[PDB]
Write a protein that holds these residues in place. Structure first.
Motif: not given
Ligand SMILES: *[C@@H]1O[C@H](CO)[C@@H](O)[C@H](O)[C@H]1NC(C)=O
Ligand SMILES: *[C@@H]1O[C@H](CO)[C@@H](O)[C@H](O)[C@H]1NC(C)=O
Ligand SMILES: *[C@@H]1O[C@H](CO)[C@@H](O)[C@H](O)[C@H]1NC(C)=O
Ligand SMILES: *[C@@H]1O[C@H](CO)[C@@H](O)[C@H](O)[C@H]1NC(C)=O
Ligand SMILES: *[C@@H]1O[C@H](CO)[C@@H](O)[C@H](O)[C@H]1NC(C)=O
Ligand SMILES: *[C@@H]1O[C@H](CO)[C@@H](O)[C@H](O)[C@H]1NC(C)=O
Lengths: 298, 285, 50
Positions: A28-29, A32-34, A60
Motif C-alpha cells: 500500500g505504501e 501511492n506517493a507524492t 487504494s
Molecule cells: C497512501 O494512502 C494511505 C491511505 O490508505 C495513506 O495512509 C498513505 O500515507 C498514502 N501514502 C502516500 C500518500 O505516499
C-alpha cells in the motif's frame, strides 16, 4: 476367531496452524506517493524479506488495469516465490498498452520494456488523483531522441544529445539536433487515454535462491479432544491434541519419542504444549460359533 | 597456538525434543580434543613487548566454531565473505550497544574495519567514538536489526568470568548462528565443562562465503599518551577458534531435554563402542 | 476437467467478488480465450491438428 479390518475412525475436521503474521510488505505504501520515479529512470525496487499480500483488487490504487502475466493472482498468498522486483514508473494511459511482452512505443524505444517470458504481475492504474496536477505536471520526463533502442531490465539515466543525419553537435540544440529529454502534459482536463497512469511491475524468481518471500499463512483455531487432521508449520498428520506438561525449551519446537514418531508439538503462535495422542487403530476382530444353523456373531 | 578443546561444539540442530534418551545423529560437529587456535586480545605494554594485534583472516572452510572469554567486553563481531570485497556480496556482523546490525552490505574490508571506544569527558563513561568499519556502496539486498540499546561492559582486568560461544554454519544458505552465554571462572583456558549451544537465528539470505574474521574495538581513553591504533592498553580478553568437521556424534538428553553429555563416534575405541551399541555405557565383551 | 469429458459452459467466469452476467470487464473475462495465431507464426504458435 477371525480378523477383517481396522477401526480407523475418520478424522472429524481439518485445522492448520501457523505463527502470527508478524511481518508485512508495504504494498500500500509503495502504491501511492507524492512523487514517483520518471519513466526514463524507472524505480527498480528490490522487494524481499517481506510477506506478500493479495487482499483485494480494488485497493487504494483500485487496480484499474491488472494482469499477472506468468503467475496465478488467485494463489498469490499460496504461491511461494522470492526475489521480487518492483519496476515502476509513471506513464500516460494511452501508453498503458505498452506493457504486454513485445509491445512497442516510446517507452519501449527509450524508457522501459518487458521481456517475453514474464512471470510477474503488471498493474497500470489511472493516476487521475495521485499524479494529476491541476496545472499539468511535466517533470515526468521521457527520452525520445536517441540513436539506439533499449532492452528490458535496462534503465537509462544519461542525457546524451541526439545526432540526426550524423550532423556533428557541439552541445547545440537546433535543426536535426534536439535534447533527448521531453516532458508530458498530464493535465487533469485531458482525456482518459491522456490521463496520468502509474504502473507497478512485480517480477520475481522461481526458487533460485532460498525463498525469503512467501505468502501469508492463515491459522485456524485449534480444537482439542477430537481426531483432528492437523497441519502445523513443520508437519501434517492426524491425531487428538491434548494439553500436557512437557517443558519444551523455548528454542525447541517439536517433540518425539525413541522411535522417531512425532507426538509432542508446541503451538505456533502462543506457548502451548500439545500431545498428539493416536486415534483408534484396533483390529476389528469377529467371533462366531459357526457358519450354519446359528448365524449369531459378535 | 594449539589448545585442547575438552568438550565444546555441542548444540541442537533439530528443534525436536527427546527426554532421558540418546540419539546418534550426523552433523557438522566440532571434533573433540581437536587443535584449537588461541588468539590473545591483550595489550602487553612492555617496550620490547609488541602490541598483540591478533586479527588475521581465518578460513571459513565448513563451519566456524568460536569461543570468546571476554570480561573487558571488547571482542564484538564477525566479518564474513568469500572475496571480502564490495564487488561480491558478503556478510558483516557488529554488536554496538547490544544492537546486532546484521547486513549484506558488503563494504570495504581494508585493514582497519574495527570499532573504537573512548572514555568521553562530556559524559563520564566509555562512549563509542570510532566507527571506521563501513565506507562503500550499500546495495543491500537484506537488512535485519534488533534494537535494544543497552551496555554491559563490566570490565575486569584480573579474572575472566563471561564466556560467549557462537557457532556459525551454512546449510543451503540458511546461515544459522548458535549462541551460549556462560558465567565462568577459569582464566587460563577453556573450562572442562559441558554446555549446549542454543540457536539464535537462521538468516536465510543465501550468501556464498569462504572467509572469516573477527571484530573488536581499538580506541582508548585520554590518560594513555598517543592515539587509538598507536596506544591501546585495555584489551584484556581472549578467544579460541575451531573448525567443525562432518561427523556423526551421539547426544544424551535428560528429562528436561538439555544435552548433558555427548560422545563422538570416531574418537576412540570405547567411543566407537558407545556409538554403535546405542548406549552411553557398555559392559564387558 | 476430469479426463474423458468435454465441458462447454459459455457462462463467463466469476472472479473479483462480483457475479458478472455476461459482462466483459475487470475480474470477469470470457473463459474461452482464443488462440493467438498469426498465419505462419513461430514454431511455438503454429496450430497443430491432433
Ligand atoms: C497512501 O494512502 C494511505 C491511505 O490508505 C495513506 O495512509 C498513505 O500515507 C498514502 N501514502 C502516500 C500518500 O505516499
Ligand atoms: C500471536 O497470536 C496469539 C493468538 O493465539 C496471541 O496470543 C499472541 O500474542 C500473538 N503474538 C504476536 C507476537 O502477535
Ligand atoms: C595440534 O597439532 C599438533 C601438530 O602435530 C599436535 O602435535 C597436537 O597434538 C595437536 N593438538 C591437539 C590435537 O589438541
Ligand atoms: C547492485 O544490485 C543490483 C541488483 O539489481 C545488481 O544488479 C548489481 O550488480 C549490484 N552491484 C552494483 C555495483 O550495481
Ligand atoms: C556463490 O553463490 C552464488 C549464489 O548465487 C553464486 O551465484 C555463485 O556462482 C557462487 N560461486 C561459485 C564460485 O560458484
Ligand atoms: C530440570 O530443570 C529443573 C528446574 O528447576 C531443575 O531443578 C532440574 O535439576 C533439571 N534437571 C532434571 C533432571 O530435572
Amino acid at each position: 476367531i477371525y480378523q477383517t479390518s481396522n477401526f480407523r475412525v475418520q478424522p472429524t475436521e481439518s485445522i492448520v496452524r501457523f505463527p502470527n503474521i508478524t511481518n508485512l510488505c508495504p504494498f500500500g505504501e509503495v502504491f501511492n506517493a507524492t512523487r514517483f520515479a520518471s519513466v526514463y529512470a524507472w524505480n527498480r525496487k528490490r522487494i524481499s524479506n517481506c510477506v506478500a499480500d493479495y487482499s483485494v483488487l480494488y485497493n487504494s490504487a483500485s487496480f484499474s488495469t491488472f494482469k499477472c502475466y506468468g503467475v496465478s493472482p488467485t494463489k498469490l498468498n499460496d504461491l511461494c516465490f522470492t526475489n521480487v522486483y518492483a519496476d515502476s514508473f509513471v506513464i500516460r494511459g494511452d501508453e498503458v498498452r505498452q506493457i504486454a511482452p513485445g509491445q512497442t512505443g516510446k517507452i519501449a524505444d527509450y524508457n522501459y520494456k518487458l521481456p517475453d517470458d514474464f512471470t510477474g504481475c503488471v498493474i497500470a492504474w489511472n493516476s487521475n488523483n495521485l499524479d494529476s496536477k491541476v496545472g499539468g505536471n511535466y517533470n515526468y520526463l521521457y527520452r525520445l531522441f536517441r540513436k539506439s533502442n533499449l532492452k528490458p531490465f535496462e534503465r537509462d539515466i544519461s542525457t546524451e544529445i541526439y545526432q540526426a543525419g550524423s550532423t556533428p553537435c557541439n552541445g547545440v540544440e537546433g535543426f536535426n539536433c534536439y535534447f533527448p529529454l521531453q516532458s508530458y502534459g498530464f493535465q487533469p482536463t485531458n482525456g482518459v487515454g491522456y490521463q496520468p497512469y502509474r504502473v507497478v511491475v512485480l517480477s520475481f524468481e522461481l526458487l533460485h535462491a532460498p525463498a525469503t518471500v512467501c505468502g501469508p499463512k492463515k491459522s485456524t483455531n485449534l480444537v482439542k479432544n477430537k481426531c483432528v487432521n492437523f497441519n502445523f508449520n513443520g508437519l501434517t498428520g492426524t491425531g487428538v491434541l491434548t494439553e500436557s506438561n512437557k517443558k519444551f525449551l523455548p528454542f525447541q519446537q517439536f517433540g518425539r519419542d525413541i522411535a522417531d514418531t512425532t507426538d509432542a508439538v508446541r503451538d505456533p503462535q502462543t506457548l502451548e504444549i500439545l500431545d498428539i495422542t493416536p486415534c483408534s487403530f484396533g483390529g476389528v476382530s469377529v467371533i462366531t460359533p459357526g457358519t450354519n444353523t446359528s448365524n449369531q456373531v459378535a | 597456538a594449539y589448545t585442547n578443546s575438552f568438550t565444546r561444539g555441542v548444540y541442537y540442530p533439530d528443534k525436536v525434543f527427546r527426554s532421558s534418551v540418546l540419539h546418534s545423529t550426523q552433523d557438522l560437529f566440532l571434533p573433540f580434543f581437536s587443535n584449537v587456535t588461541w588468539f590473545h586480545a591483550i595489550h602487553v605494554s612492555g617496550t620490547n613487548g609488541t602490541k598483540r594485534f591478533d586479527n588475521p583472516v581465518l578460513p571459513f572452510n565448513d563451519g566456524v566454531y568460536f569461543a570468546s572469554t571476554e570480561k573487558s567486553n571488547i571482542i564484538r563481531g564477525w566479518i564474513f565473505g568469500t572475496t571480502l570485497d564490495s564487488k561480491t556480496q558478503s556478510l558483516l556482523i557488529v554488536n554496538n550497544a547490544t544492537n546486532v546490525v546484521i547486513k549484506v552490505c558488503e563494504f570495504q574490508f581494508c585493514n582497519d574495519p574495527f570499532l573504537g571506544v573512548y572514555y568521553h569527558k562530556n559524559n563520564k563513561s566509555w562512549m563509542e567514538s570510532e566507527f571506521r568499519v563501513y565506507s562503500s556502496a550499500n546495495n543491500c539486498t537484506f537488512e535485519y536489526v534488533s534494537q535494544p540499546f543497552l551496555m554491559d561492559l563490566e570490565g575486569k582486568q584480573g579474572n575472566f568470568k563471561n564466556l560467549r560461544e557462537f557457532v556459525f554454519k551454512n546449510i543451503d544458505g540458511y546461515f544459522k548462528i548458535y549462541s551460549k552465554h556462560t558465567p565462568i571462572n577459569l582464566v587460563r583456558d577453556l573450562p572442562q565443562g559441558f554446555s549446549a549451544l542454543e540457536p539464535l537465528v537462521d538468516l536465510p539470505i543465501g550468501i556464498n562465503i569462504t572467509r572469516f574474521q573477527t571484530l573488536l574495538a581499538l580506541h582508548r581513553s585520554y590518560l594513555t599518551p598517543g592515539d587509538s591504533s598507536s596506544g591501546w592498553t585495555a584489551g584484556a580478553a581472549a578467544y579460541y577458534v575451531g573448525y567443525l568437521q562432518p561427523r556423526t556424534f551421539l547426544l544424551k538428553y535428560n528429562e528436561n531435554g538439555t544435552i548433558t553429555d555427548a560422545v563422538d563416534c570416531a574418537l576412540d575405541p570405547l567411543s566407537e563402542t558407545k556409538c554403535t551399541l546405542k548406549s552411553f555405557t557398555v559392559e564387558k565383551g
